[PDB]
Design a protein around this ligand. Structure first.
Ligand code: ATP
Ligand code: ADP
Lengths: 712, 47
C-alpha cells in the first residue's frame, strides 16, 4: 500500500512535492526530509517534501516536467521511500540543449547559478531534466554527471561544470535503449513465456537454490522475419534492468579469422564480470549455419568457439543467453542439446487483435485524420507481420504527402508551417497503401490463430460429435484416459467430394481446443519433394511441437501418393509422442492413392466421410454467406435450398457471388443512367438458371460405394 | 494522375523566357520596365 497515486500539479517546481500530513503519517515521514519517488522502467527521483493540507489524503503534487522525466502519466502509481542517507553534491556537470536555446544567445549558466541554487539544496540525480527561466525563454538542461554518488543534493559549495557542447533531445528518445512492454502488442503468450524464462533466473535466483536445481540458460526464439524478435528481446532486457550486450551475427561473421573469437571471448568475459547480465544474438544461423551446406573451416571454428564458451559457462551466474533465427532447423543441431539453447519459443503472425494493437502503437504520433477505423484495417490485414504494418503506415503518410505537395513548391528551401498544420492521413490513403503492400510471411508455413466455431459449420452434427469425442476430450480430460489407460488417437483423415467444407471443420476443431492451426497445402509438399522449398516437413513438425497445442492440416495429401516425402512423413508422425497435444488432419478427395502404411495404427487411422450438405445445411450456408450484403426484404431462400440438390458449399458460394456481381452491374448501369444497394429476386433467378454441379452422379456413386465398403 | 505530382513544378512570376540579345553585352541583361514594376525592380541593382 505505500504506492501513491500520481496527481497533476499546477505548480511547475521541479524538486518540490507537496503532500498532506496523512501521506507522511502513513510512511511516518518527517518534515524537511527529501523522499525518493520511483515510477516505472528504472525511473526514480528525489524531491523535497512540503506539507499542503489543502491536498486530500493520498494526493501528491509533482509538476508535469518531473513526471515526463520519470516516464509516467497522470493518475499512475509511484512508490515512495524515505531518504535517511541524504547527501549534498560536491561536483555536478551539466550541459545545455541547442534546440532549447534557440532565439537567445549567451551563457545562461552564470545567470542561473545563483538564482536557482541560492542555498536551495535541491536534490539531484543522474539524468534529471530541470527547466530554468533565462531572458524570455524557459531552457531545460540535463544532469550529465553528479559526484559523489549516488544522487546528492545541489548545495551552494557544489562546483558546477558547463564545459561541453549541446546534445539534441530526440536523439536520446531514438536510441532504442528505452522500450518498455507498452511498445509491444499481440504477443502476450510469447512475452509471458520469455519473462518467466528470464526474470526468474535473474530477478529471483534464490528460488532455484531453495528448490535445488540448475536454472536454465539457453533460450532460443524463432519466427518469420520482421516479427519483432529483436524488439521483444530489447524490451525484456530493459525491463529486467540487467546489463545488456548485443552481438550481431552479420557483424561477427564480417571480420577476418581470429578477430571473431576475440570479440566473442571479450563479450562473454565482460558479461560474466557484470552479473546479472543478458547476452543476445542476431541471426545465430549466419554464424553457426547448417554444416551440411557450409563445409568451410571458418564457420566450423566460429561455431566450435561458441560451443566452448556456452559449455564453459559457470554454474552460478546471473547470465542468460538468447538467440534469434528465421528457420528453427537452419542452425547447427549441436546447439539444441541439453545445457545449451533448449527453451524454444515460437512467434507466429499476430491475429486480428494483435494487428490492431500493433497498428495502434505504431500510429501513435502521426496526424491521423478525423475518420480512422483502425479496426477495419486490422480486419482486412490478414497475414501481416508488424514490419509490414509499419511499412503500411509509412506508405500511407507518403501518399498523403503526395496529395498535399501540389499546394507547396519544393524548389524553395522553406515550407510554410500553415501547410504542415493541414497534414493528415485519411482513410482513402490507408486504403491505397494497403493496396500497394507486399506481405510475404504468409507465403510459408507459419503458426497462426483461428477463431472459427461450430456455428459456421452447416450441419454434420454426427461428425461434430464424433470428432469432439476423438480429439477434444483427451485435450481437457487426460485424467480419464490415464485412469482407463486408453491411448489417444491422433490421425484423422477426411474423405469426400471436393469443396465440401473440410478446412472449415479443421479450423473449427482447432479453435475448440484453443490450439494454433498450421496449414500445409499439397503444392508445398510437392515443392519440398523437389527440394526447391526452403522448409522441410521436419521443420513443420518441429514448429508444431514448439507451438503445442497445435492442429497440423495436410490438404490434398493424395497429391504425394513421390515416395520420399511419404516416408519422411511416416517417420516424423510415428516418432511423435502421442501424449503430446499434437494432431494431424488430412484431406483428400481420392482415398485410393494413399499407401496402406498411412492407415496403420498410430497414424491416419480414423476415416471420416464428408457428405454433401443437406437442404437444411444448404439453407444454413446460404444464410451464413449473406451477412454483409443487404437483401431484398421478403426474400425466401427455401426455393434456392430445395433447387440445389447435389450442390456443394463452394457451388452455392459461387452462385451467391455471381448474383451479387449481377446486382452490382445493375447498380452501375442505374447510376450511369445507389437506388439498388441490395439484391433482388431476378438476380437469384439468373444465377439458378446459370446453375450446374461440380460433381457428377458417378463420382457420388463411387464415394458411396467406398464408404459402404469401409463400413463393412 | 497524382503519382506524378512531384514532377510538375508550380508556376511563379520570377521565371523568365530566353532570347538571343541584340546587344553584345555579357554582364548586362535588359528586360521591359513592366517586369521590373511587377517585381519592383529598379536601376543600379545587380541581379
Ligand atoms: N509489437 C511489434 N511486433 C513486431 N514488430 C514490431 C512491433 N512493434 C514495432 N515493430 C516493428 O518491427 C521492427 C522490429 O522488429 P525487427 O524487424 O527488428 O525484427 P526481426 O526481423 O526479428 O529482427 P532481427 O534483425 O534481429 O532478425 C521495427 O520495424 C519495429 O518498428
Ligand atoms: N459444412 C459446410 N460444408 C460445405 N461448405 C461449407 C460448410 N461450411 C462453410 N462452407 C463454405 O464452403 C467453403 C469451403 O471452402 P474450401 O475449404 O476451399 O473447400 P473444402 O472445405 O471442401 O476443402 C468455404 O468458403 C465456406 O464458406
Amino acid at each position: 500500500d505505500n504506492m501513491l497515486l500520481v496527481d497533476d500539479a499546477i505548480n511547475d517546481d521541479n524538486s518540490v512535492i507537496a503532500i498532506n500530513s496523512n501521506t507522511m503519517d502513513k510512511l511516518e515521514l518527517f518534515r524537511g526530509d527529501t523522499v525518493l519517488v520511483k515510477g516505472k522502467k528504472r525511473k526514480d527521483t528525489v524531491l523535497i517534501v512540503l506539507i499542503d493540507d489543502e491536498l486530500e489524503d493520498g494526493a501528491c503534487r509533482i509538476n508535469r516536467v518531473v513526471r515526463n522525466n520519470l516516464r509516467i502519466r497522470l493518475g499512475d502509481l509511484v512508490t515512495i521511500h524515505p531518504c535517511p542517507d541524504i547527501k549534498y553534491a560536491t561536483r555536478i556537470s551539466v550541459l545545455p540543449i541547442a534546440d532549447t536555446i534557440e532565439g537567445i544567445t549567451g551563457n545562461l549558466f552564470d545567470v542561473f547559478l545563483k538564482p536557482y541554487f541560492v542555498e536551495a539544496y535541491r536534490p539531484v540525480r543522474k539524468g534529471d531534466h530541470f527547466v530554468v527561466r533565462g531572458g524570455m525563454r524557459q531552457v531545460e538542461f540535463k544532469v550529465v554527471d553528479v559526484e559523489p554518488e549516488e544522487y546528492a543534493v545541489v548545495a551552494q559549495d557544489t562546483i558546477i561544470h558547463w564545459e561541453g557542447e549541446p546534445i539534441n533531445r530526440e536523439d536520446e528518445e531514438n536510441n532504442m535503449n528505452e522500450v518498455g512492454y507498452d511498445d509491444i502488442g499481440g504477443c502476450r503468450k510469447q512475452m509471458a513465456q520469455i519473462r518467466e524464462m528470464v526474470e526468474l533466473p535473474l530477478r529471483h535466483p534464490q528460488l532455484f537454490k531453495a528448490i535445488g536445481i540448475k536454472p536454465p540458460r539457453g533460450v532460443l526464439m524463432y519466427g518469420p522475419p520482421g516479427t519483432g524478435k529483436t524488439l521483444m528481446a530489447r524490451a525484456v532486457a530493459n525491463e529486467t534492468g540487467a546489463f545488456f550486450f548485443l552481438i550481431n551475427g552479420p557483424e561477427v561473421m564480417s571480420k577476418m579469422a581470429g578477430e571473431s573469437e576475440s570479440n566473442l571471448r571479450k563479450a562473454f568475459e565482460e558479461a560474466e564480470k557484470n552479473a546479472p547480465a543478458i547476452i543476445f544474438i542476431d541471426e545465430i544461423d549466419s554464424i553457426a549455419p547448417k554444416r551440411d551446406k557450409t563445409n568451410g573451416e571458418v564457420e566450423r571454428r566460429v561455431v566450435s568457439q561458441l560451443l566452448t564458451l556456452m559449455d564453459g559457462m559457470k554454474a552460478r551466474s546471473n547470465v542468460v543467453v538468447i538467440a534469434a533465427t528465421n528457420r528453427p532447423n537452419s542452425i547447427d543441431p549441436a546447439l539444441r542439446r541439453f545445457g545449451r539453447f533448449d527453451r524454444e519459443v515460437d512467434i507466429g503472425i499476430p491475429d486480428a487483435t494483435g494487428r490492431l494493437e500493433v497498428l495502434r502503437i505504431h500510429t501513435k504520433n502521426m496526424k491521423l485524420a478525423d475518420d480512422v477505423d483502425l479496426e477495419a484495417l486490422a480486419a482486412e490485414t490478414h497475414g501481416y507481420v508488424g514490419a509490414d504494418i509499419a511499412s503500411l503506415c509509412s506508405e500511407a503518410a507518403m501518399q498523403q504527402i503526395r496529395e498535399k505537395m501540389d499546394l507547396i513548391d519544393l524548389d524553395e528551401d522553406e515550407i510554410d508551417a500553415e501547410v504542415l498544420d493541414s497534414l493528415g492521413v485519411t482513410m482513402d490513403n490507408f486504403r491505397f497503401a494497403l493496396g500497394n503492400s507486399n506481405p510475404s510471411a504468409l507465403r510459408e508455413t507459419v503458426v497462426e490463430s483461428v477463431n472459427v466455431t461450430w456455428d459456421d459449420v452447416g450441419g454434420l452434427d454426427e461428425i461434430k460429435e464424433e470428432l469432439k469425442e476423438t480429439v477434444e476430450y483427451p485435450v481437457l480430460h487426460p485424467d480419464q484416459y490415464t485412469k482407463f489407460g486408453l491411448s489417444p488417437s491422433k490421425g484423422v483423415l477426411f474423405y469426400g467430394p471436393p469443396g465440401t467444407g473440410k478446412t472449415l471443420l479443421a479450423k473449427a476443431v482447432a479453435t475448440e481446443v484453443s490450439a494454433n492451426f498450421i496449414s500445409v497445402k499439397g503444392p508445398e509438399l510437392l515443392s519440398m519433394w523437389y527440394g526447391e522449398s526452403e522448409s522441410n516437413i521436419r521443420d513443420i513438425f518441429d514448429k508444431a511441437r514448439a507451438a503445442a497445442p497445435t492442429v497440423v492440416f495436410l490438404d490434398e495429401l493424395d497429391s504425394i501418393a513421390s515416395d520420399r516425402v511419404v516416408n519422411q512423413l511416416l517417420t516424423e508422425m510415428d516418432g511423435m509422442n502421442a501424449k503430446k497435444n499434437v494432431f494431424v488432419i488430412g484431406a483428400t478427395n481420392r482415398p485410393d492413392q494413399i499407401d496402406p502404411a498411412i492407415l496403420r495404427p498410430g497414424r491416419l487411422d480414423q476415416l471420416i466421410y464428408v457428405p454433401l450438405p443437406d437442404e437444411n445445411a444448404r439453407l444454413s450456408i446460404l444464410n451464413a454467406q449473406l451477412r454483409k450484403t443487404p437483401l431484398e426484404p421478403g426474400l425466401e431462400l427455401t426455393a434456392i435450398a430445395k433447387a440445389t440438390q447435389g450442390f456443394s458449399g463452394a457451388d452455392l458460394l459461387y452462385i451467391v457471388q455471381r448474383a451479387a456481381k449481377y446486382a452490382i452491374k445493375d447498380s452501375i448501369e442505374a447510376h450511369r443512367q445507389d437506388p439498388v444497394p441490395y439484391i433482388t429476386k431476378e438476380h437469384f433467378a439468373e444465377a439458378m438458371k446459370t446453375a450446374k454441379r461440380s460433381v457428377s452422379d458417378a463420382e457420388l456413386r463411387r464415394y458411396e460405394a467406398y464408404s459402404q465398403q469401409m463400413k463393412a | 494522375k497524382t503519382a506524378t505530382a512531384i514532377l510538375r513544378r508550380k508556376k511563379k512570376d520570377n521565371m523568365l523566357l530566353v532570347d538571343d540579345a541584340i546587344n553584345d553585352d555579357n554582364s548586362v541583361i535588359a528586360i521591359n520596365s513592366n517586369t521590373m514594376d511587377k517585381l519592383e525592380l529598379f536601376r543600379g541593382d545587380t541581379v
